[PDB]
């Protein structure tokens, strides 16, 4: 069987703090 | 490998690879820490 993942599976890309920012 | 072998001799190689990332440090140079100072302009150094 299959299903839609939606917006799952984002993770923290690096061990650094950031706030109020849009990081690519 | 025979002792009569210069370039044909064995060499022991150690490669040190450094995990120079932003996690907690755990392997450090022999440098002694100071006390910590606040609200004053300081020439600081944390983990390097
Ligand atoms: C995803 O799976 C559904 C059925 O579970 C199917 O209708 C759809 O065409 C599939 N899409 C892709 C891109 O696999």
Swiss-Prot record, chain A:
It comes from the Viruses. Attaches the virion to the cell membrane by interacting with host receptor, initiating the infection. The major receptor is host ACE2. When S2/S2' has been cleaved, binding to the receptor triggers direct fusion at the cell membrane. When S2/S2' has not been cleaved, binding to the receptor results in internalization of the virus by endocytosis using host TFRC and GRM2 and leading to fusion of the virion membrane with the host endosomal membrane. Alternatively, may use NRP1/NRP2 and integrin as entry receptors. Binds to host ACE2. RBD also interacts with the N-linked glycan on 'Asn-90' of ACE2. Cleavage of S generates a polybasic C-terminal sequence on S1 that binds to host Neuropilin-1 (NRP1) and Neuropilin-2 (NRP2) receptors. Interacts with host integrin alpha-5/beta-1 (ITGA5:ITGB1) and with ACE2 in complex with integrin alpha-5/beta-1 (ITGA5:ITGB1). May interact via cytoplasmic c-terminus with M protein. May interact (via N-terminus) with host bilirubin and biliverdin, thereby preventing antibody binding to the SARS-CoV-2 spike NTD via an allosteric mechanism. This is Spike protein S1. The lineage of its organism: Viruses, Riboviria, Orthornavirae, Pisuviricota, Pisoniviricetes. The chain holds residues 27 to 50 of 1273 of the full protein.
């Amino acid at each position: 069987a299959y299903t839609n993942s939606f917006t799952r599976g984002v993770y923290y890309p690096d061990k650094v703090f950031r706030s109020s920012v849009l990081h690519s | 490998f025979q002792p009569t072998n210069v370039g044909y001799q064995p060499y022991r190689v150690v490669v040190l690879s450094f995990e120079l990332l932003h996690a907690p440090a755990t392997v450090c140079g022999p440098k002694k820490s100071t006390n910590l100072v606040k609200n004053k302009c300081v020439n600081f150094n944390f983990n390097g």
